[PDB]
Design a protein around this ligand. Sequence first.
Ligand SMILES: CC(=O)O[C@H]1C(=O)[C@@]2(C)[C@H]([C@H](OC(=O)c3ccccc3)[C@]3(O)C[C@H](OC(=O)[C@H](O)[C@@H](NC(=O)c4ccccc4)c4ccccc4)C(C)=C1C3(C)C)[C@]1(OC(C)=O)CO[C@@H]1C[C@@H]2O
Ligand SMILES: Nc1nc2c(ncn2[C@@H]2O[C@H](COP(=O)(O)OP(=O)(O)OP(=O)(O)O)[C@@H](O)[C@H]2O)c(=O)[nH]1
Ligand SMILES: Nc1nc2c(ncn2[C@@H]2O[C@H](COP(=O)(O)OP(=O)(O)O)[C@@H](O)[C@H]2O)c(=O)[nH]1
Ligand SMILES: Nc1ncnc2c1ncn2[C@@H]1O[C@H](COP(=O)(O)OP(=O)(O)O)[C@@H](O)[C@H]1O
Ligand SMILES: [Mg+2]
Ligand SMILES: [Mg+2]
Lengths: 441, 434, 367
Amino acid sequence: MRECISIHVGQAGVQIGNACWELYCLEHGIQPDGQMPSDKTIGGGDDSFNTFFSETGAGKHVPRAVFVDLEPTVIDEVRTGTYRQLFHPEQLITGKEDAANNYARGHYTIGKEIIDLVLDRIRKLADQCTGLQGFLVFHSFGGGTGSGFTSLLMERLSVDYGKKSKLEFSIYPAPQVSTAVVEPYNSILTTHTTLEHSDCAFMVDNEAIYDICRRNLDIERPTYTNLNRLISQIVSSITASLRFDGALNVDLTEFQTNLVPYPRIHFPLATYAPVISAEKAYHEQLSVAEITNACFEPANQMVKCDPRHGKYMACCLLYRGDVVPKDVNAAIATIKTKRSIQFVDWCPTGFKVGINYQPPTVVPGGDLAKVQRAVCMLSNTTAIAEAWARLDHKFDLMYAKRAFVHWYVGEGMEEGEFSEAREDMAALEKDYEEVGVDSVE
Amino acid sequence: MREIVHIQAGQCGNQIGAKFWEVISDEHGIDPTGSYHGDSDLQLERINVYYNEATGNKYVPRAILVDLEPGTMDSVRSGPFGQIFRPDNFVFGQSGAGNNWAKGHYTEGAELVDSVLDVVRKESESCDCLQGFQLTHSLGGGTGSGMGTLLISKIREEYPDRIMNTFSVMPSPKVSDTVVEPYNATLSVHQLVENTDETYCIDNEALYDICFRTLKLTTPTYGDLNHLVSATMSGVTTCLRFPGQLNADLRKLAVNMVPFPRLHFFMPGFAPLTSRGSQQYRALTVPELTQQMFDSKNMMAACDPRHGRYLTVAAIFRGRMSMKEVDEQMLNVQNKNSSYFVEWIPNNVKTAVCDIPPRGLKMSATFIGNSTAIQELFKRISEQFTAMFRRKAFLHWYTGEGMDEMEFTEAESNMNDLVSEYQQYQDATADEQG
Amino acid sequence: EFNSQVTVAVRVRPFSKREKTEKASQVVFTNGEEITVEHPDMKQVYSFIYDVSFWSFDECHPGYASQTTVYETLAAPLLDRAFEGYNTCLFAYGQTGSGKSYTMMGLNEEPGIIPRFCEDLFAQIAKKQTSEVSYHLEMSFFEVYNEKIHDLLVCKGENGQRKQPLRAREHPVSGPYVEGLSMNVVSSYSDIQSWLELGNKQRATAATGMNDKSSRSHSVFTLVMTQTKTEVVEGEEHDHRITSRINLVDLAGSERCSTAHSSGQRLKEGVSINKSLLTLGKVISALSEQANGKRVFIPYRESTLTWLLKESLGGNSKTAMIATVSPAASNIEETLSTLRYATQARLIVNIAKVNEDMNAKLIRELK
Ligand SMILES: CC(=O)O[C@H]1C(=O)[C@@]2(C)[C@H]([C@H](OC(=O)c3ccccc3)[C@]3(O)C[C@H](OC(=O)[C@H](O)[C@@H](NC(=O)c4ccccc4)c4ccccc4)C(C)=C1C3(C)C)[C@]1(OC(C)=O)CO[C@@H]1C[C@@H]2O
Ligand SMILES: Nc1nc2c(ncn2[C@@H]2O[C@H](COP(=O)(O)OP(=O)(O)OP(=O)(O)O)[C@@H](O)[C@H]2O)c(=O)[nH]1
Ligand SMILES: Nc1nc2c(ncn2[C@@H]2O[C@H](COP(=O)(O)OP(=O)(O)O)[C@@H](O)[C@H]2O)c(=O)[nH]1
Ligand SMILES: Nc1ncnc2c1ncn2[C@@H]1O[C@H](COP(=O)(O)OP(=O)(O)O)[C@@H](O)[C@H]1O
Ligand SMILES: [Mg+2]
Ligand SMILES: [Mg+2]
């Protein structure tokens, strides 16, 4: 009835997808073989929740997703691991060669030869659906596939499907930490092509979750298995009202409206406040007021950006579990009282609320605890212009000497595409200033 | 699928590569018959990168052994892992190049080169998708310098969209092992600059210091030295054979290591190397490995990076590492040692992590670095070269095989321009205001 | 002591069939010397000054620069200096379908610069052909295609594939040159015209989305003129010789793969053109910064084009640039890249000298 297609692009989308479908199975009672044993004593219901899992008459449940990397190393871990009997065998690897961290290869050489094959399985999945609400693209700024192949896809998907929510959950490059020397080019050429096609892009940064895992969860040597489970919760909260009941339900078309003032500033951030271990799970009450304030603490942001250097435009608060609206209304009045959380003049009602009853589920082997409450904040702020400005400066240092361009030019790109992108990102940087000026009369 | 063809030219490469298959087979569970006697199921998943399946799950490597002397090929056959190579892939002749680059390029090598292309075209066409090539040679002689550089000139024409990696033993600064090292090392650089994408520069005097200063070895043979080179050769090609959290092919490194098409000369390294006693007194962890990798006394290139600036470096990790422990540590280098890095590349470091470590170590690491301190090696040859060519000392053995003095002057000015391309970057730069 | 500045000139082309089908707007306006670009969005206006500007937008409007006008304003000075004893270079630069080949070579009934140059050269020679001065003229015409060199002035043999590539080498004094190149003698305009026809027929052309006759190769026209003169000396006369190299260069365009619908050889050759322009650009950016005190190393070895033209962009030649631009609004950023590289080429300074063919010998020490 309500059905969402998730797309996982690259070595980062997948290892987040593996972190997601691990969780989507637990909440709904599915085993890794795709079977739902408990249904035999219900004889019905909708635990075979059609938002993510499609059911066969034999009792098996297939997830609605595409997994694409242009390399076999990451997906072949699925075909051989514990979640091999769950997915359709059509997981797409023409990855005889990778993109070499090159927007040109993911967009002009090797993004071809698989893109028509990728639209086919999506065209197949959608015809199995009735209420196609939107898409969920998991990718990473910094790669060739997650930057190039995503752009090429968001273009082609904006034609075959048109006016539907295309939500991105993207790993934004950290300011200092990085694992490549070509993230700026791949991140600036991506925004230039995705801005006219996407509808809302939720950013994350690994440099921040590393810090969150240190202070709160007391993990001093974490890895990506811990990071991606936190992301599995952000998406579960977003797509919860499409699965379970609640007091205030939130469709996908509500983030597109509340959090996008103008079509070019659709770059919000994500948080998850009650990230605490089983040790700190006691000793604390974990109220809505305890949780809601923790979503506004800059040290608990999943993107390395201080909103106190900027202003808020639209905030969306998604509540889970034993939550009562009186507890929420008292909280926002506390946040609107604090003067360090500044809102623009042209948005006095800068809050969106959603309440669902199903609490979060604890994955065995994880470091997160069991809680009766969980909250996810989605915020659009003017502070993220600082990060764009860093990225445009890095670009300028290494484009003025035409460094690394012959790798891009050698795979189908023109030198003029670099200058077009930088100016577009400069306009956006300027657009983030106009919205920060208080009007006069 | 990312298949690689290995080519071994000279008494050096055929002595290195012969250990390279003693090191890879132990990692994939292959015995000296080609039979599989391993433990894990990840070995056979991507064994096709280096090996081919023959009849009964016997595995034959994609090696190519070339030389102008049959003595080296007899050592392989009459050795530990001699019975696995394809006996139709041993190409050889007699009456070797005589330390003459003129013979291995024009006169003798040109007679034997088409035989080498017969093997290459058969192994490449038999491969599903070619990632690139791999050559182990020694420039300083005539076979590896001459007959190797000639093959690269030809494969680059037939396979111009594929990687051509090269592991080259360079002339050493203090003591020579061939009187005409400069003429042969020079002319090779004139060709490698135009026809390569990654050239790993090795020097034996550094390995003599590694084996003495770190490993505390008092009698290091060439087996031990080549037991170090084979390691780095395995680290570069690890993320194609085993999985991990952040994988890196050959092209992803070069795209992240070659900022301009001519600066593809690297200073490799390996960690953690230790003596057999101090092993029980160390703690294996990333901050202990990163200190060895970035140590100037763990390089194989005989060049001090502290006399220059790292344009860009890489680090390939193998084990159940923590990524926060990795990303935190690489940042500590740039912020601490910011003078040894360039300003117009904000992050001068790439990282990669595999999940399946080496046979007996819970964690290993491989290091690749592009620095302006490689200027010192080329600037030396240019001094020795012109000192000899200005008097025309040994030139009549090169002209008598069909060469001219102009071809000696071209290679001089090219190598001198590569010096200037590295020297502009080494001096600290500054914009007007920035 | 001499520091000859590079003569930059610009040529605005009229609308094309594509830019008339898509009713594209005029944004490049002129007033004479200056050229301005009013963006359609009307957020900022850029303007540039050049030594010479040409406006072929309208065949009726005053200021219309024709083939004869561009010749008499750009090439005729180069001919005067070439007779004086200087080396000369004239090279085009721009995007796909912008009027580079039309400007230099021209068509049958609309000649470009090359035929007019050779014609006026032979005319002045025939008018100054005394026993005091003799003249000897050699020509070459060659091609750069996928980083390979090719001779245009040969009648290829019949085969499945007959394009024998040549090699580039570095002579310690004369600089870079091509080994195996046909240098054909010429006595008058007819042989030049025949060789030009043969070369333009052997050159690489294809049909792409932005020009049906898109040149897929860089083209260099070299003229070596040796003029011999006398001086009354202790013995026989005919003891002075002056050599001059004239290099007329028509390059290709950047060719974005999206607009220029390209797959396979067109992509391949197009990509090669893109790598040749990136290198050339980097050499024009380093030569414009080396003329402002800052020390820089020009990368000429990263492309055969810049390697052969080492002596023209820099070194010893009086050189001139013809930037070619389109006035439509759908190509603003590419036109602006052309104009910025031209304004940087304006700052280049070379050291041009007379090729008396006598330095270090006897009259150097006379001097
Ligand atoms: C703890 C213990 O019992 O002994 C260790 C040992 O002493 C050390 C020093 C080993 C030892 O290595 C050497 O002694 C050596 C000698 C000459 C040149 C280079 C090394 C060791 O032989 C090496 C061996 O490690 C391996 O075998 C790796 O798998 C290695 N394998 C081979 O190269 C190999 C060679 C011939 C036949 C079969 C395997 C390897 C290295 C790189 C990539 C893949 C595999 C190990 C743990 C040890 C001994 C055995 C002492 C070290 O090996 C390396 C290069 O990784 C040297 O430093 C490491 C650290 C180890 O602790
Ligand atoms: N959170 C998270 N981030 C990852 C993971 N793997 C890679 N990344 C991020 O991705 C960035 C690099 O891009 P990739 O993920 O490798 O993109 P890709 O799809 O592999 O593109 P290619 O490198 O061409 O194969 C790094 O900066 C990482 O921070 C992961 O498993 N989890
Ligand atoms: N590292 C290493 N280098 C070697 C070895 N054998 C030879 N070399 C080097 O190779 C060079 C000799 O050239 P070589 O190829 O053997 O000459 P050829 O026999 O005529 O082909 C010398 O400069 C040595 O430094 C070896 O076993 N290990
Ligand atoms: N001044 C002009 N007058 C009339 N037609 C022109 C003029 N300039 C260019 N053209 C037309 O535009 C096209 C130019 O293509 P060309 O110059 O060969 O492309 P490129 O410069 O990329 O090689 C020709 O077909 C020519 O007829
Ligand atoms: Mg990848
Ligand atoms: Mg043309």
